[PDB]
């Protein structure tokens, strides 16, 4: 029931989280000068598996993200 933007092609604020996350990841990656392969990615396709935890954590964030209609239902 509880929703905000995740209803019909919405949720703009989320983009800021994506961009921010990307920037943060870039900074962290730069700071953590650890030569291995690619921030523990082990092949591009492998990233797909990361979509599981990412989607879960992200969905939760999106669920809490007070976008369009104030909701905030995460703990």
Swiss-Prot record:
The chain crosses the membrane at residues 12-32, 44-64. Residues 33-43 are periplasmic. It comes from the Bacteria. Activation requires a sequential transfer of a phosphate group from a His in the primary transmitter domain, to an Asp in the receiver domain and to a His in the secondary transmitter domain. It is found in: Cell inner membrane. Member of the two-component regulatory system ArcB/ArcA. Sensor-regulator protein for anaerobic repression of the arc modulon. Activates ArcA via a four-step phosphorelay. This is Aerobic respiration control sensor protein ArcB. It comes from Escherichia coli (strain K12). The gene is arcB.
